[PDB]
Amino acid sequence: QVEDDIQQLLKKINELTGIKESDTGLLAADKQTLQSEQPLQVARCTKIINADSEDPKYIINVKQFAKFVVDLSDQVAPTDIEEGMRVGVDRNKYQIHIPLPPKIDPTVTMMQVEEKPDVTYSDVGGCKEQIEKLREVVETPLLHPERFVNLGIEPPKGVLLFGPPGTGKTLCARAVANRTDACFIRVIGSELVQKYVGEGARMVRELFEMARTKKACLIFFDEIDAIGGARFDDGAGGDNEVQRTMLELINQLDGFDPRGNIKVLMATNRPDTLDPALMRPGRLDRKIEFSLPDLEGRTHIFKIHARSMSVERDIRFELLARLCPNSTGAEIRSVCTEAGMFAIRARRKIATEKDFLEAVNKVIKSYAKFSATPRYMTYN
Amino acid sequence: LKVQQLLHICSEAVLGIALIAMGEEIGAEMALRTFGHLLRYGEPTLRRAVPLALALISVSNPRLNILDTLSKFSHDADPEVSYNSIFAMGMVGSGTNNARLAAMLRQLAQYHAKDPNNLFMVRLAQGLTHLGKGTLTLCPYHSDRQLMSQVAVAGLLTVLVSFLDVRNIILGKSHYVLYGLVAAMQPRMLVTFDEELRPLPVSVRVGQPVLLAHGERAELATEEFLPVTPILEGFVILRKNPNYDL
Amino acid sequence: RNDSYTLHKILPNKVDPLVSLMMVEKVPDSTYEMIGGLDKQIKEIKEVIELPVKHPELFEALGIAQPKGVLLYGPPGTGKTLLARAVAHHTDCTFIRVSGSELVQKFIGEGARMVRELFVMAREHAPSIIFMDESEVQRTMLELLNQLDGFEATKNIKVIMATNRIDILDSALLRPGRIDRKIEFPPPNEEARLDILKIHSRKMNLTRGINLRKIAELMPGASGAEVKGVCTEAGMYALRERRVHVTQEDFEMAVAKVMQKDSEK
Amino acid sequence: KGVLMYGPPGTGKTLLARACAAQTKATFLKLAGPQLVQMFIGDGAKLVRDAFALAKEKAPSIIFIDELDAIGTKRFDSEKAGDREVQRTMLELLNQLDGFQPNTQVKVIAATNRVDILDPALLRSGRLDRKIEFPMPNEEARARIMQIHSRKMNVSPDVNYEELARCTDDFNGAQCKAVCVEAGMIALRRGATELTHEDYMEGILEVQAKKKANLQYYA
Amino acid sequence: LERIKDYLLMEEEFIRNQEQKQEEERSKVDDLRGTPMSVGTLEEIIDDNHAIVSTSVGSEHYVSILSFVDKDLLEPGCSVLLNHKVHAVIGVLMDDTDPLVTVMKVEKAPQETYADIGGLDNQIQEIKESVELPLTHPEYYEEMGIKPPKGVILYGPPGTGKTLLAKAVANQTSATFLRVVGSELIQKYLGDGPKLVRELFRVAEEHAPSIVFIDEIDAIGTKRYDSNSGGEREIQRTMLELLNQLDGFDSRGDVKVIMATNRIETLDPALIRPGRIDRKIEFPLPDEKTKKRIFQIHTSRMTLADDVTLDDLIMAKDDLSGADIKAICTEAGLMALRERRMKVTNEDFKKSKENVLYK
Ligand SMILES: Nc1ncnc2c1ncn2[C@@H]1O[C@H](COP(=O)(O)OP(=O)(O)O)[C@@H](O)[C@H]1O
Ligand SMILES: Nc1ncnc2c1ncn2[C@@H]1O[C@H](COP(=O)(O)OP(=O)(O)O)[C@@H](O)[C@H]1O
Ligand SMILES: Nc1ncnc2c1ncn2[C@@H]1O[C@H](COP(=O)(O)OP(=O)(O)O)[C@@H](O)[C@H]1O
Ligand SMILES: Nc1ncnc2c1ncn2[C@@H]1O[C@H](COP(=O)(O)OP(=O)(O)O)[C@@H](O)[C@H]1O
């Protein structure tokens, strides 16, 4: 309390203090700039139909109003004003005041990641081969962009990840967007199909629109199965809307007019329901699989997972890994944390072999009926 | 006393919050959050100083946000901002790169030369970038001593007026005031020492990098092994379980 | 204030939305004294609604979680909505008719995305009975049943979900405790009909020498609505005969004319 | 009156357009079938007309239509719901290609990875005169393609294309390319100067995408 | 003693706190704006304290903020204070009480209690420990380098007590309780299974640590409602949506997950897998003891004829769950209220048993 006593009074000093000069000094950062830019201006945005020559007079449709063929700002050349360019229009005077850039809607920007998911290549044990190629599709071309010219070639401009549910594909997205640097666009096909007809087409564009103005960006599509994979067809025209959306993605994803530095990452569990047009190379080159860890792998998965907790140092995860034939690296995680309960269920700090053994037999086995890793292996 | 005061003193001096980066801790709660916003203030006295002021913050709560923005504002209203934006990134980066300043080291690594002065400043900065082989940490209290050091505290605002006075007037009448920070400048440091206690083998839990021998590098570690008084992040000296003693 | 865009003054009334929804539904405002042959139910209803509300302390005082949900099952057109309306009327509770009309959603609910909003309005005018006419309906009541199953707060709200052929409704809507009092409607015999017959025939101008029983005797397989058709035609017949009154003969015709329709589609 | 391209989805058709685009000094008119797919009940027809007019005022013009399927699909006849736009737009389009008022001022070239779903009033013979297959190539052609993509990169003297060509198992054009592509990145591994035969075999080894193994017990 | 010095210290702090030229400046800040202003929606943004807005009438002006409040306080596509002149951004706004958070956000108590669920236990400790625990006493996991049981699943016949648990926890819980039904997860508008999931999950993430609960996740499959579209190639995505939201990328945080299904054979393995849903808990259908606690609990809070023996009922039904027993308890109530009798009798339960169970 004496220290605590000193704490209170000390704080009260400033409290007492702050009030003092407060009385003394009794807007301009802005009220200037506000009033400064109050004599400034507004300008209704405009959509240019097109300009004309032997003189200028640019021709334009604003928006809620209509078309006005109108003069342009003196401060903008007759070039830096290409068609299809949302420009700003002296409101009253109705004359090009200044130019601008393009729309992208509030659905494409809402998915530009901003932050970054902490998932370094340390958590990605048991994939010395998976990440190995991935780094080629995404890492190396985006960073060291010399070699591929020193020898002149091109990298798997897009790459496919598949495997049952629980191999670590979303970590590789998270892994990449972590130690990547480029622009990682997280777009889920769940996002792609909406309500009104021909709406997804706008998304891919925006996607490819926004992918473009920003050289070297990773578009990633997890659950592409949602967007569109098969091209049925019959007397119902069901999965039609989505199909086009795929064709849209297809078209813009590698068909006439290059794409650019838009690298591509697709994540699926069923890499079997996917249109040849996606799969083909150009569009989707490097095809990478995510095995269900064997022996040495799981040991890395166990060691990685348990490496971050108070475990018994005698017990060797190798034994446990042995009792784990074909369980994804996710389940192996329910064990490592599973013991947590057991270890906590008594009152103990450190877990024992059996604690894991039970967990192994408690998770794996018990939660076997579910698993779904054997039904999703054949991609059903 | 920094925000509440200055905040009311500024709106009622552009170096005001520069010192503030200073006593940090607050460099993370506000310095790291509001720091950049300070920097964004159009007054160059801020745009000069905040990049400097970020430094101890940068080794006490550095950020990645503005780290890129400095690149943006490099030539925004000024090339000295650029001259800073190169230099400043060296500063904050020269002892707080990667991890928290990942977006910082990158730029400077992508900073080379558009100008022999840029090149000069970049060579400075990338020197600063790799200053201490790129591993250093600025903290009023080296390791986990649990005691404030007024030695380095004196090494700082010294560097504020030195680079703040000559900055407000011409480029740089000199350049020998670069090192005044060294009075405390520490590495990225975990000092991990043995039960006898002049340098000898001894080890910890894992770092990044291994079991750390006497004074081997990392920063802010909470390890398996025990220190002597108040086990902590940072400098920890190592005694081991009599049965398992080592 | 027009240009000042400040309040000039506050006009009176607002019009309500839930009231608007109710208007748009237009579900006969029925008072008890007009449904003969529906007591046992009513009693049950009173037991499951009137008593539960009038004195929730009775079931609280007994130590029994009062009820919220009810079911009405039988022939279609014998007088189910009435029992839901009449009580609700006689209950002074907002009686709501949530079906599936896009009109109603635009008024009451600004679309939202589910049917949980409908509850907000019911709360507001609570005590309020929620009704529903004849797969999609089941779920519409299901979601509601879970909201008033120790998980919703407030109280004083009874969804009457009254359809036909209980064999149609799903299982999940039958887990013994979940439809508090399941009451069933019986077809309408001579008496009930006779009673119903006397209620509807009372509306129109009915002459003497009119034995209604004889009429329900001829009747065999009608409901609460059917009889109404007969009466109407009796009048309808007399109207065409240029006669204000309505002798027995007329009704005896309508029987066929309705039993023509009864036998028709 | 214009042509229709069909066949595997990797053989190579978009190049043919690309080829015409660079060759046909005429005003190239490339358009995606999806674009014509719109929301506002009157964008598809309008756009087609708009596009069908713009061409009529710059003769000559080759309008390329990638994947007719986008806007190409039979018209069912249901109750409950059913694509009206994609239909009408087709109809509108149909009513444009032929129908009232003829026109030989515009050339219309449409490729589709699938010449089935397309309704049967787009093919006919008047709409698009020439039905044109793009068969997945043989070998020499394969040997021919690989070469094209092997040209740029710095190879050496030890890459029997025909071998590679032979090894190739039903590879639409691009997959050679892909092999070609992969073999390169492969070749960049040991950073060796110019690629070699082995490197290509390994492109094949991968450009195939045939999963793992463990089947090392065969024979 | 120093407590007094400590108290007044706390008091002096209150005074300076309350203790918060300027009047003109404040009026300058009032004067700057306009009376009245204009609502309008955000579109793009620029470091020039101005971007283009969005309007119902759809004028989109480039405009500054009146700057003390902030641009970074807001996101593109958001309604902002605009003048009527240039529609100048006059400041931020507060996304008014939407109609999502409300519905999905059970405030009042959930009733019941963790000593109301007769015949349970290991089922209880499993849930609590996995979820309720790490929420209250979360201090162990912080040392065993473990985290919490991600999601949890409850299943079993109809009446095993799955909703009780969701009800029990909420009774003594301390985190926002989001009660979303899957059946509601099926609307009649294409691409609307992924908005609901996002809104519920987005609403859950906002309210910070909370319990997302999904009772009848099965209804998302074991059902094809007329008014829908796509038939089942839509529900799938909605699953996919759930599967993805309930799972990967970003970094979900403290959204715990509670699913209540009767049949676990109709759940996509992607939802069951661990990560997404770890702890899988079953709800057995009493027996002879649990029922006793269930019966005693349901008949112990009322004038239950101390004559009869809950036993007769327990040994009555074949495999009656924890519901049927409750129905019989209640049946007597109406019996009781019927013949006007404060206390119930034997037949009353009999008629109930035969009135509910049998029928
Ligand atoms: N080899 C591995 N190393 C580390 N973590 C793994 C590994 N395999 C699986 N996991 C864990 O299991 C989860 C599986 O995620 P993911 O495979 O993306 O799910 P889905 O199959 O639904 O996309 C990840 O969150 C990851 O943490
Ligand atoms: N018991 C009854 N007595 C009198 N009229 C009845 C009775 N039952 C139904 N009706 C008639 O049916 C009409 C309403 O039918 P209703 O019962 O709501 O349809 P449903 O059979 O679907 O419940 C009322 O106009 C009323 O005249
Ligand atoms: N004969 C060929 N020679 C070279 N490349 C070809 C050939 N045929 C196809 N391709 C490859 O196919 C790609 C174009 O594929 P394309 O057939 O246009 O797809 P789609 O048919 O679905 O539009 C080009 O990158 C090209 O390298
Ligand atoms: N053993 C029991 N203890 C307490 N309440 C029970 C018990 N068995 C059934 N109930 C009651 O019956 C209802 C059954 O709901 P629930 O267990 O969720 O079944 P379902 O999962 O099929 O909906 C619960 O609201 C609960 O109050």
Measure in Å the smallest separation between the Cα of A18 and chain B Cα atoms.
6
Sequence-ordered alpha helix ranges (H) in E280-359: 290-299, 310-314, 324-338, 346-353
Inter-chain contact C172–E158, Cβ cutoff 8 Å?
Answer: yes
Ligand 4: does its nearest atom lie under 6 Å from the Cβ of E156?
Answer: no
3-state secondary structure of E303: coil
Burial class (CB in 10 A: 0-12, 13-18, 19+), A57: middle
**How far apart are alpha carbons E5 and A2 in whole angstroms?**
11
| Alpha-carbon span E245 to E268, nearest angstrom | 15
Query: Measured between beta carbons, which residues in chain A are less than 8 angstroms from residue E52?
Result: 45, 100
Ligand 1 center from residue B136 Cα (angstroms): 35
Pairing, β D107-112 against β D3-6: parallel
- Spatial contact of A226 and A188, defined as CB atoms under 8 Å apart: yes
| Upper half-sphere CA count for residue E208 (Cβ side, 13 Å) | 3
Residues 31-70, chain C, touching E (beta carbon < 8 A): 47-48, 51, 58-59, 62-65, 67
Pocket of ligand 4 contains residue E326 by CB under 6 Å: yes
Sheet strand arrangement including E79-82: E62-64, E50-54, E38-42, E79-82, E89-91
Q: For C159, list phi and psi in degrees, rounded to 5.
A: -75, 110
User: Binding residue per annotation — C36?
Assistant: no
Q: Which residues lie across from D64 on neighbouring strands? A: D30, D109
Neighbours of E201 (CB within 10 A): 21
For residue C71, report the phi and psi dihedrals to the nearest 5 degrees. -135, 140
Tokens, residue A331: 């389940």
DSSP E312-325: HHHTTSSS--TTHH
Least Cα separation, residue A250 to chain D (angstroms): 10
Longest CA–CA span in chain A (Å) reads 89
Residues with Cβ within 8 Å of residue E333, at least 6 apart in sequence: C59, C62, C64, E302, E344
Contacts of E246 in chain A (CB under 8 A): none
- Whether the CB of E159 is below 8 Å from some CB of chain C: the reply is yes
Q: Is the CB of E159 under 6 A from ligand 4?
A: yes
Q: Rounded CA gap, D68 and D119, in Å? A: 10
Angle between helices D140-152 and D173-189 (to 10 degrees): 40
Query: In the structure encoding, which two tokens stand for residue D170, read together?
Result: 């039903």
Interface of E with C in 48-107 (CB under 8 A): 84, 99-100, 102-104, 106-107
Between chain C and chain E, the number of residue pairs with CB atoms below 8 A apart is 118
Cα C187 from Cα C74, distance rounded (Å): 8
DSSP chain D: --EEEES-SSS-SHHHHHHHHHH--SEEEEEETTTT--SSTTSHHHHHHHHHHHGGGSSSEEEEEE-GGGT-------SS---SHHHHHHHHHHHHHSSSS---S-EEEEEES-TTTS-TTSSTTTTS-EEEE-----SHHHHHHHHHHHHHS---S---HHHHHHH--S--HHHHHHHHHHHHHHHHHTT-SS--HHHHHHHHHHHT-------TT--
All residues of chain A having their beta carbon less than 8 Å from the beta carbon of residue B106 are 181
Chain-centroid distance of CA A15 in Å reads 46
Q: Of the ligands numbered here, which is closest to the C-alpha atom of D137?
A: 3
> CB–CB of E86/E32 below 8 Å?
no
Residue whose CB lies within 8 A of the most ligand 2 atoms, among C26, C29, C81, C82, for a mutation test: C82
Q: What angle do CA E164, E165, E166 make, to 5 degrees?
A: 90
Residue with tokens 């008593």: C51
Is C231 in contact with C197 (CB distance < 8 Å)?
A: yes
| Ligand 4 pocket check for E149: Cβ under 6 Å | no
Instruction: Please state whether E4 falls in left (phi above 0), alpha (psi between -120 and 50) or beta.
Output: alpha
Residue with CA at minimum distance from ligand 4 atom 24: E164
Is residue C78 marked as binding? yes
Give C112's contacts in chain E (Cβ within 8 Å): 99-100, 103
- Measured between alpha carbons, how far is E25 from B219 in angstroms, rounded to an integer? 48
| Phi, psi angles (nearest 5°) of residue C85 | -80, -50
Residues 224-243 of E with CB under 8 A from C: 225-227
Ligand 3 close to Cβ of residue D105 (< 6 A): no
Contact B197, B243 (CB under 8 A): no
Sheet holding E279-282, edge to edge: E105-106, E176-181, E210-215, E255-260, E151-155, E279-282
Helix (H) or strand (E) holding C255: helix C248-262
E243 phi and psi, to 5 degrees?
A: -60, -40
Touching, D vs C (3+ Cβ pairs under 8 A): no
Neighbours of B210 (CB within 10 A): 12
Nearest residue (CA) to ligand 2, atom 18? C81
Residue C262 CB coordination number (10 Å): 18
What resolution in Å is listed for this PDB structure?
A: 3.5
What's the token pair of residue C104?
A: 């109603």
Classify strands A87-89 and A96-98 as parallel, antiparallel or unpaired. antiparallel
Q: Number of Cβ pairs closer than 8 Å across A and B?
A: 21
Instruction: Answer yes or no: are the C-beta atoms of A308 and E145 closer than 8 Å.
Output: yes
Query: Residue C13 belongs to what H/E stretch?
Result: none
Residue with tokens 């019989």: E328
Counting as contact any 3 or more CB pairs under 8 A, the partners of B are A
Contact B166, B158 (CB under 8 A): no
Interatomic CA distance for residues D93 and D74, integer angstroms:
14
Chain E environment of C67 (Cβ under 8 Å): 330
Report H helices in E162-218.
Answer: 162-172, 193-206
Mutate which of E163, E282, E294 for ligand 4 pocket (most atoms within 8 A of beta carbon): E163
Contacts of A371 (CB under 8 A, 6+ apart): A327, E269, E273
Q: Are C204 and C231 in contact (CB under 8 A)?
A: yes
Cα E64 versus chain centre, distance: 39
Enumerate the β-bridge partners of residue C160.
C70, C131
Phi and psi torsions of D107, nearest 5°: -110, 135
What's the CA gap between D179 and C12, in Å, rounded?
Answer: 78
Three-state secondary structure call for residue E180: strand
Q: What tokens were used for A268? A: 């699926």
> Minimal Cα distance from D149: which residue of A?
A153
Please state whether beta strands E79-82 and E89-91 pair in parallel, antiparallel, or not at all (unpaired): antiparallel
- Chains adjacent to D (≥3 CB pairs closer than 8 angstroms): A
Beta strands in chain B (DSSP E): 192-193, 236-237
**Among the atoms of ligand 2, which is closest to the Cα of residue C133?**
22
C123 has which bridge partners? none
Helix, strand or coil, per DSSP, at residue A257: coil
A209 at the E interface (CB within 8 A)?
no
Residue D4's DSSP bridge partners are D110, D131
**Is C38's C-beta closer than 6 angstroms to any atom of ligand 2?**
yes
Output the six-digit token pair for B218. 């990392």
Contact in structure between A34 and E32 (CB atoms under 8 Å): yes
- Take residue C149 and report the two structure tokens written for it: 């199953």
Secondary structure letter of residue C187 according to DSSP = P
CA of E313 to the centre of ligand 4 (A): 17
Question: Is there a contact between B190 and B207 (Cβ–Cβ < 8 Å)?
Answer: yes
Name the residue among A267, A274, A273 with its Cα closest to residue A170. Answer: A267
Give C225 Cα–ligand 2 centroid separation in angstroms.
5
- Ligand 3 centre distance from Cα of residue D15 (Å): 6
- According to DSSP, the β-strands at E176-181 and E105-106 are antiparallel
Q: Which residues have C-beta within 8 Å of that of residue D18, sequence separation ≥ 6?
A: A256
Q: What is the DSSP string of A139-208?
A: HHHHS--SHIIIII----SEEEEE-STTSSHHHHHHHHTTS--SEEEE--HHHH--SSSS-HHHHHHHHH
Q: CA–CA separation, E304 vs E333, rounded Å?
A: 9
In sign, the C-alpha dihedral spanning A258, D73, A105, A137 is negative
Contact flag E184-C117 (C-beta cutoff 8 Å): no
In the block, residue with structure tokens 């000093």: A13
Chain A residues in contact with B16 (beta carbon < 8 A): none
For chain B, what is the radius of gyration of the CA atoms?
Answer: 19
Here the tokens at position C49 are 């609604």
Q: Quick one: DSSP state of residue A234?
A: S
- b/e map of A221-257 (b: 16 or more CB within 10 Å)? bbbbbbbbbbbebeeebbbbbbbbbbbbbbbbbbbbe
Q: Is E321 left (phi over 0), alpha (psi -120 to 50) or beta?
A: beta
The beta-strand segments (E) located in A196-332 are 217-222, 262-267, 286-289
Q: Distance from CA of residue E264 to its chain's centroid?
A: 22
Q: Which residue of E has its CA nearest to A238?
A: E230
The amino acid present at A230, given as its one-letter code, is A
Question: C232 CA to chain E: closest CA distance, Å?
Answer: 37
CA trace torsion A168, A174, A178, A181 (10° rounding): 120
Do A99 and A43 form a contact (C-beta atoms < 8 A)? no
> What's the rounded Cα separation, in Å, for the pair A260 and A157?
9
Q: Of all helices (H) and strands (E), which one includes residue A364? A: none
User: A240 vs D209: CB contact, 8 Å cut-off?
Assistant: no
Put simply, the answer to whether C150 touches E106 (Cβ < 8 Å) is no
**Beta carbons of E334 and C63 less than 8 Å apart:** no
Are the Cβ atoms of E61 and A174 closer than 8 angstroms? no
CA nearest to A191, candidates B129, E237, E276: E237
* Cα–chain center distance at A190: 13
Report yes or no: A18 at the B interface, CB cutoff 8 Å. yes
Cross-chain residue pair A26–B12, CB shorter than 8 Å: yes
Instruction: Tell me if B187 sits within 8 A of B216, measured CB to CB.
Output: no
Residue D38 near residue A244 (C-beta atoms within 8 A):
no
C-alpha C149/C-alpha E297 separation (Å) is 18
CA-to-CA separations, C127 to C53, C94, C141, D82, in angstroms, rounded: 8, 6, 18, 45
Taking CA atoms only, the protein residue closest to ligand 1 atom 22 is: A165
Residues with Cβ < 8 Å from B66, sequence gap 6 or more? B35, B36, B39, B40, B54
Buried-state track C214-243, b at ≥16 Cβ within 10 A, e below 16: ebbeebeebbbebbbbbbbbbbbbbeeeee
Contact (CB, 8 A) for E225 and E189: no
Which one of A151, A153, A231 has the shortest CB-CB distance to D114? A231
- For residue A287, give both structure tokens: 């095809």
Beta carbons of A228 and A242 less than 8 angstroms apart: yes
Task: Confirm or reject contact between C176 and chain E (CB < 8 A).
Answer: yes
Tokens describing residue E97: 């009480």
Contact between A63 and A76 (Cβ < 8 Å): no
Mutate which of C29, C38, C78 for ligand 2 pocket (most atoms within 8 A of beta carbon): C78
- D86, with CB counted inside 10 A (0-12, 13-18, 19+), is buried
State which ligand 1 atom lies nearest to the alpha carbon of E244. 22
Which chain D residues contact residue A289 at CB under 8 A? 211-212
